[PDB]
Write a protein that binds this DNA or RNA. Structure first.
Ligand SMILES: [Cl-]
Ligand SMILES: [Zn+2]
Ligand SMILES: [Zn+2]
Ligand SMILES: [Zn+2]
Length: 117
DNA sequence: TGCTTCCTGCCAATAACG
DNA sequence: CGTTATTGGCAGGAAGCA
């Protein structure tokens, strides 16, 4: 028992009973709620750190391996995450990768095992 | 104030369950 | 083994940090 529902204008919101954060879908509330309950743990496999979300652990573990998955297509430089890539493309190439063009390539993750696309 | 990490709608990949 | 439920990768804006 971790939420209540709030309905405004026919739109359904799921509210965390602990911190009152609002979610459009229940899956997100359940993913969020682990921060409170710590029902599941996500331990780094390279150090002692433990995370409340699987994706937080993954981003952290990529830091351990040093893999650079985000590649700028304008000059070929590669980056650890979206933020480094975006900062680069905006500052050096004066372009926005969230725009209407494909300015970067996200390589598959090869330095560790996560599900592929 | 420029890195560092967090956050959540969306949904493909994966697991659970008969 | 077909049907259903769950996980968690991803973008890219937000929040944290020193
Ligand atoms: Cl690499
Ligand atoms: Zn909460
Ligand atoms: Zn670690
Ligand atoms: Zn570049």
């Amino acid at each position: 028992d971790d939420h209540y529902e709030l309905i405004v204008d026919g739109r359904v919101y799921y509210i965390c009973i602990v911190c009152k954060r609002s979610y459009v879908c229940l899956t997100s509330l359940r993913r969020h709620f682990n921060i409170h309950s710590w029902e599941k743990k996500y331990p780094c496999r390279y150090c002692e750190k433990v995370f409340p979300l699987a994706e937080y652990r993954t981003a952290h573990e990529i830091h351990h391996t040093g893999e650079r998955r985000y590649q700028c297509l304008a000059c070929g430089k590669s980056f650890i995450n979206y933020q480094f890539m975006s900062s680069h493309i905006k500052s050096v190439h004066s372009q926005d990768p969230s725009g209407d063009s494909k300015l970067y390539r996200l390589h598959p993750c090869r330095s560790l095992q996560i599900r592929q696309y």
